[PDB]
Design a protein around this ligand. Structure first.
Ligand SMILES: C[C@H]1O[C@H](O[C@H]2[C@H](O)[C@@H](O)[C@@H](O[C@H]3[C@H](O)[C@@H](O)[C@@H](O)O[C@@H]3CO)O[C@@H]2CO)[C@H](O)[C@@H](O)[C@@H]1N[C@H]1C=C(CO)[C@@H](O)[C@H](O)[C@H]1O
Ligand SMILES: C[C@H]1O[C@H](O[C@H]2[C@H](O)[C@@H](O)[C@@H](O[C@H]3[C@H](O)[C@@H](O)[C@@H](O)O[C@@H]3CO)O[C@@H]2CO)[C@H](O)[C@@H](O)[C@@H]1N[C@H]1C=C(CO)[C@@H](O)[C@H](O)[C@H]1O
Lengths: 894, 897
């Protein structure tokens, strides 16, 4: 439904504008005598309760963001709606996802931004007070949740599925990041030497040289968002120039295309003059500049044929050098320079200083970048250069930007282990896909063709995945009901976007060499592999029918299992895993919290489900290949024997730190993975040539199950509080009960260790919903828990989440799964809508957490593949395309 | 269910105490690195969703209140739980009413007091940071809502039902009150000269003179609560001495008994040493001191027979003086002094200064009070004194207070128009009830018994009055009228203890706020609203009394309202023509119109509706002579007919009556609320037509009622707009002066369904009810008047000062009551009962009906207009409607008969 300006009730100093829009006044409503909110209100009739997206068309030509409080039914929504500076004469759209009641809902936008959680404002108070006067037009209310507008992922990886990962990062990746620089392509990891970051940065500078205007270089100090399209191409949308607070009158968009089964990254910059029709055309110079890893002694010569710098970069002791081409698809207006930066790009401007002034005006006229920042002329050699701190650049000059007419400028990166291979690459990548000196025409077409090939290649990969039942997806595998299930199609556009975004994001975060997943695409978690996260990630890919990349992961996990050579206790014996591994090595264990004994079970569960999934898709050769692989078979058997042998006299396996990694004891979560691990082992027994062990493992699975379900008040305590109707966190080392309600205890019902309709499942689910809910359907891990809030361990800095016990989409996912399975589809669908609005700008799966105080996903660990997986498991479970359930544990082998 | 200390999960620096209780740490959780909440948590299984009372046994031996954030299911409840200083070795109980979900609920108390609404903390930040270390014991979760613990009424009236009203007031009656002094009996209005406040104050000073301790006078600068018991006796419970922040080791309680059909006010002070058994007994001196109205030239002589100061107080030009006796029921150890205060009792200590020090230590050794404050010896004459600024006092000395042994000290007030009548009064009131006239000297024995007997007679007399009211169906009330269903209805009994307390408290509070001379109700018992009579409030109040079967005090009101109707002799427009009422009248005059917001045209209709319901109620109770007397009284009959003719004649071209300011008094236009009163007014007139000797007018008025009803229900999009938004499914606030629609959703539009102008099951009723619930709900079942409304918050008009309510659009129990009535009538009893529970926790400390508003940000009723009889009435209408003992519905408007 559409609400035009004339449908609004005006409040306070909100006035009608002669131009038909509404004038919103500057500033925050003070707590003074007769103070009233200024803004707009209207009423919307909701046919059914649930999530709707509320949008406002607006203009903001000031050099600061405006903030308004969204209020539904007189209740201030978490956080404030941000109205960012709009380019030239363009109209922006601000939007929020809100839970509406059935029937009439009041929708109000006002300057009452004065509420606090935990003594904090959702954005700094000084920015709420500096909120400038701006204009709003039409409001829209549409059915369905939308991703967070205000919070974007600020670090994402692009993979070629073979040997090359690049990271594209905004100017700030976490609140606590003191340095500012971006957006940029800042990391490059290639198979030949995967640990090494080949680059310092590859980034784009813009210079206005419009006749009659003050010439000025805009360096990479922009607010930005970034997200994948449906076809695996990464989009970066530029906002305000942070140092001046200006929306430049040109809209800047960049796409990065890492071409699968090639060695090419295409960068496409779209420049659109957003000034009114008939205004003086703008003229811009654009520099694409690359700093090589400063420590690596490197040399470069110009290649005039391919219009590229050819770099030889040393790789350290005893390793062959890497050869890189950094090219410019524009020829006629292109100049080139090699030498030094001439500036510290990460020491020129800090976001903390606000609109402190364009740092380009302070740059000395030295180096490739200093020169361009200073007067638009790169300083250095047009032939070549050599040393540490090597920099190269290409400038495209006198680019005419007419009102409303998009101009594309493209650049490229290729790597090879030999100059001869790089030259062959360059002949390929400076021409169209099918297809000597490159022209403006052949360059433009090459960039287009290879960008399109990226899209085609990712489409062919994602066509191995199931179509979402009821969606407009047709090119994938036929939507099929899983065992036990009935198809339950969804027409939800939000579900289709999130499903697609989730799959592409999981695959782009997978090591192309090794098959291990980055737990987070943000360096806050050091790109480390958590074996739990990756296992749970692969379970999701299998559910989605993506058995190939899943298979690559399961075989990797088998290969890195600890064989017990250096065993000192059960936690690192045969059949166990390191909590962490490196993302850029075949097998580099990294010391972290230990023991975590959930990985054994999840390995068995996921491998079992992977085997069965391949059989379900008729991939019988691939299934037989997997289960008969000596490494997989031995790894699975060792893990099974570990759980079986380490069952104690109380029927529980060893104490651990488990999923939250924060307390030692007999955790319900890990105990469930033990029981279901042995269940999985029993199921696989015959196929692993271990038929005689099937009954032992089935008995083991029942023994641990019976221990979990045993009352806490029994003579030998179990993990079930019968008095309160919920699982406990854990039994402590000394036999006392940690009675804390933990949303992760829904894992019992998720795997079907208890039936989802059992008293155990329904009572536990109700306890968790009752005690751990924030923002309607956000579930906390447990109460009085400060990770992302006060905790020093908070990866993005303290109070990134302001509300204690932040909401975790993974926990909301468990609730949705258990709710769906027990016939409560209302709760299941509300949960899915909630997870969809926990996603970041442009539909990127978020990190671990969501600040229920601010209505914002956490930036610092966006994006987290395991979160994407749990959404996919949740959604496909709700359409009956998967069942998260394992076979019932009975103590009988099949 | 009970949760002992050992059932708690301890958080942060909360520790087990060797003594079996839990040590809660000092201070507020800061916003610093690794900061964690300190406190306790446990889980409670609720069989059914709804309101429960959560209690904590505790001790606080510091000289500051402790505050904790109550958190249910990880959601901070509105405001903070206050843990006040505990006397000696006593154990206190802190409690909150909370909505629980079906199944498991987490109950947590912690120091995370850092949340803000509208940039404000629910108590001053410095007090949250100063929250001292204290100990908690057992927690209790009990089914049902309880009144607000933290907020008390701070001004209540006691009536003798004939000719005397006294006001008993705490040290502060509103946040904006800059002066501090109380508790006291501060106002006294007698029938002979009702406008005049006879007193400055009558108050009690306490002096510790315990051997071996530093002697010190505690003046009336105490935190206190006050509420009526079931029998119309007013209780004042003393808290901390504000100037030192100390809970004195003696628990002080005062009862005030204004004896009906007499001229006596008894003050009973209960002193209970709360120190441990076997500790040194304490010794106290107690002064009861009275300042006369300072402006009135007065004289006093001592009466040693009755042990009282006899005051002659001038009344102004052309009026005979009033005679007062201020007496001491203690004769042994009594001294007496007359003269001047010697101090400004309202300029000695301010609450704003915090624990600034005992102001008694700064008092000069001058005057009755200065002297007692200074060294325990009143300064003045033991014979008499004369002038302006007259003060008198009696001190009772060497009162021994043993651990746990309550000692009663009693004082008295009597007034008369002649010294001869005062002497007769004094013989009566210094002896036990039904004593033969004795003018012999009062002794310690006769005094103690007199105080007791006259206090008991107050209880008996109010019991006889309230026994004319219906027993609440399903309650333990038996001494009242038999619980009866209203015609066509079935009894729906309630075993709710909360309902019984609130019902009883509501009735006694309404009657204690009625003018004994005139029958008009004070809109508020708090001077913020100048004790003015709002004719709407009083009409709606009387409707509630009639529902409760209290037809006598209702009848006294309806006859008064008839008598003060404007006859139109000086009419300048429709708003003050024949059949209209002044928005305000004086509470201390027969007929003193007071200029306020005008016109308000809702009073005409409410007069007709309430008079109709009053007539029918008397018939229902077999009071046929009283019914016939009422409807045939020339004043009542003419007043009703004039109001009916006013509504009929003033129906405009759109079928709506004249524009007005209506119930909220804040906007001019064609308000749905007032239009409903027009339509139902004519309905009432039609019903009464034959009994008023106006049978020929019955059909005209019935047609009028239908005409206005049809206009209300006419769509806003019709060529001539009505008040029904068909697109959005709700009534609009009003049509504006210029014919535009004010589309604002207003909870008062539920009045249509309350009176049955639309059936409660109609699409109109259910859609409007849903719109109001959806848009105007705070704190689960609190309903705002309308959105973006700053009365009690930012508004300069806020009677208790700005931001008394921190949350914009405060919750109004009257609006929650309408929702409960409409919900019950449409079969949604869950919503109806949740609403009743919500109103019950909107009541003030000790079960006093609140004022108009409740701050949904702080979980506290507003102090500044506590208590408001109309709020009490709407709860009574709501409750009796839910038990089927009344129906708020009028006969269906059809246009027939
Ligand atoms: C990522 C992780 O962050 C937090 O973990 C911290 C631990 O709780 C601390 O106790 C501390 O562990 C250190 C030991 O104290 C020290 O003695 C030594 O053994 O080194 C340990 C590692 O530093 O420091 C940890 C932070 O580094 C937080 O408590 C925990 O919940 C977080 N875990 C989540 C993250 C991921 C990765 O995506 C998931 O795999 C988990 O399931 C999440 O729970
Ligand atoms: C008690 C009443 O207080 C508030 O009313 C204020 C009005 O909103 C203002 O308009 C202003 O009225 C003045 C006029 O502006 C002026 O032209 C002249 O007519 O004098 C008027 C007298 O001051 O000031 C008013 C306060 O003085 C508030 O808006 C309103 O809602 C309040 N009414 C409630 C109080 C009672 C008393 O129990 C009930 O009868 C009503 O139902 C409540 O609505």
């Amino acid at each position: 439904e559409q609400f035009v300006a004339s449908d609004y009730t005006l409040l306070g100093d909100a006035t009608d504008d002669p131009n038909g829009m509404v004038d919103m006044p500057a500033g925050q409503e003070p707590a003074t005598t007769n103070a009233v909110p200024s803004g707009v209100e209207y009423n919307f009739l909701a046919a059914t309760a649930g999530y709707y997206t509320v949008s406002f068309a607006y203009q903001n030509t000031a050099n600061a963001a405006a903030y308004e409080q969204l209020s539904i039914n007189g209740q201030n929504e978490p956080g404030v709606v941000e109205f960012d500076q709009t380019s030239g004469a363009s109209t922006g759209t601000a939007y929020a996802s809100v839970y509406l009641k059935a029937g009439l809902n009041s929708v109000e936008l006002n300057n009452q931004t004065t509420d606090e959680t935990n003594g904090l404002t959702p954005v700094p108070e000084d920015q709420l007070q500096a909120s400038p006067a701006f204009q709003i037009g039409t409001s829209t209310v549409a059915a369905g949740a939308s991703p967070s507008q205000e919070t974007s992922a600020q670090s994402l990886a692009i993979s070629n599925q073979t040997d090359m990962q690049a990271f594209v990062q905004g100017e700030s990746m976490a609140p606590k990041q003191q340095w500012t620089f971006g957006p940029s392509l800042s990391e490059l990891h290639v198979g030949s030497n995967d640990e090494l970051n080949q680059l310092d940065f590859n980034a784009v500078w813009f210079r206005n040289v419009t006749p009659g205007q003050q010439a000025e270089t805009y360096s990479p100090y922009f607010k930005s968002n970034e997200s994948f399209d449906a076809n695996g191409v990464l989009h970066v949308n530029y906002g305000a120039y942070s140092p001046t607070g200006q929306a430049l009158p040109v809209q800047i968009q960049a796409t990065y295309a890492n071409v699968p089964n090639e060695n090419l990254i295409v960068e496409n910059l779209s420049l659109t003059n957003q000034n009114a029709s008939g205004t003086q055309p703008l003229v811009w110079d654009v520099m694409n500049a690359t700093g090589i890893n400063p420590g690596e002694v490197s040399s470069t010569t110009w290649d005039p044929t391919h219009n590229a710098w050819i770099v030889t970069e040393d790789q350290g002791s005893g390793k062959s050098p890497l050869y890189l081409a950094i090219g410019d698809y524009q020829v006629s207006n292109s100049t080139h320079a090699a030498g030094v930066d001439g500036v510290n790009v990460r020491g020129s401007y800090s976001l903390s200083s606000g609109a402190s002034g364009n740092p380009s005006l302070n740059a000395p006229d030295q180096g490739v970048i200093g020169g361009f920042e200073n007067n638009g002329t790169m300083v250095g050699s047009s032939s070549g250069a050599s040393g540490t701190n090597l920099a190269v650049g290409t400038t495209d000059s006198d680019v005419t930007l007419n009102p409303g007419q998009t101009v594309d400028l493209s650049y490229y990166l290729s790597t090879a282990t030999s100059l001869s291979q790089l030259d062959a690459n360059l002949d390929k990548y400076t021409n169209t896909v099918g297809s000597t000196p490159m022209t403006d025409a052949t360059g433009a077409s090459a960039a287009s063709s290879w960008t399109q090939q990226t899209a085609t290649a990712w489409d062919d990969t994602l066509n191995q995945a199931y179509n979402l039942a009821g969606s407009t997806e047709t090119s994938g595998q036929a939507a099929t009901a899983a065992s036990g299930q009935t198809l339950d199609p969804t027409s939800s556009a939000a579900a289709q976007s999130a499903y697609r975004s989730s799959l592409i994001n999981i695959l782009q975060a997978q090591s192309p060499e090794y098959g291990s997943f980055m737990a987070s695409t943000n360096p806050s978690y050091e790109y480390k592999v958590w074996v739990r996260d990756s296992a749970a990630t692969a379970i999701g890919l299998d559910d989605a029918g993506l058995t190939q990349p899943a298979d690559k992961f399961w075989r990797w996990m088998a290969s890195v299992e600890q064989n017990g050579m250096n065993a000192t206790y059960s936690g690192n014996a045969s059949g166990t895993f390191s909590t962490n591994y490196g993302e850029f090595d075949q097998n580099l264990p990294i010391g972290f919290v230990a023991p975590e004994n959930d990985s054994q079970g999840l390995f068995l569960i996921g491998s079992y489900r992977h085997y069965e999934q391949m059989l379900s898709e008729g991939q019988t050769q691939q299934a037989q290949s997997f289960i008969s692989d000596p490494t997989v078979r031995q790894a699975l058997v060792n893990s099974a024997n570990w759980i079986q042998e380490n069952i104690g006299s109380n029927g529980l396996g060893p104490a651990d730190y488990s999923i939250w990694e924060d307390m030692y004891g007999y955790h319900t979560f890990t105990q469930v993975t033990y029981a279901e691990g042995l269940n999985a082992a029993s199921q696989l027994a015959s196929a692993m040539g271990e038929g005689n062990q099937a009954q032992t493992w089935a008995t083991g699975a029942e023994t641990i199950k019976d221990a979990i379900l045993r009352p806490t008040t029994a003579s030998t305590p179990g993990l079930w509080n019968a008095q309160e109707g919920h699982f406990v966190e854990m039994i402590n080392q000394n036999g006392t009960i940690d009675n804390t309600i933990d949303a992760d205890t829904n894992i019992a019902a998720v795997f079907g260790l208890v039936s989802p309709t059992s008293i155990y499942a329904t009572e536990n689910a109700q306890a968790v919903e009752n005690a751990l809910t924030q923002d309607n359907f956000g579930l906390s891990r447990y109460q009085n828990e400060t990770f992302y809030q006060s905790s020093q361990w908070s990866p993005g800095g303290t109070y990134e989440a302001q509300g204690i016990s932040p909401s975790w989409p993974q926990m909301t996912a468990y609730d949705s799964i258990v709710s769906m399975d027990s016939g409560n589809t209302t709760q299941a669908n509300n949960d899915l809508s909630w997870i969809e609005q926990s996603y970041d700008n442009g539909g990127t799966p978020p990190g671990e957490s969501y600040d229920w105080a601010r209505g914002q996903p956490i930036e610092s660990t966006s994006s987290e593949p395991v979160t994407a997986s749990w959404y996919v498991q949740d959604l496909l479970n709700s359409t009956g395309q998967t069942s998260t359930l394992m076979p019932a544990i009975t103590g009988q082998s099949r």
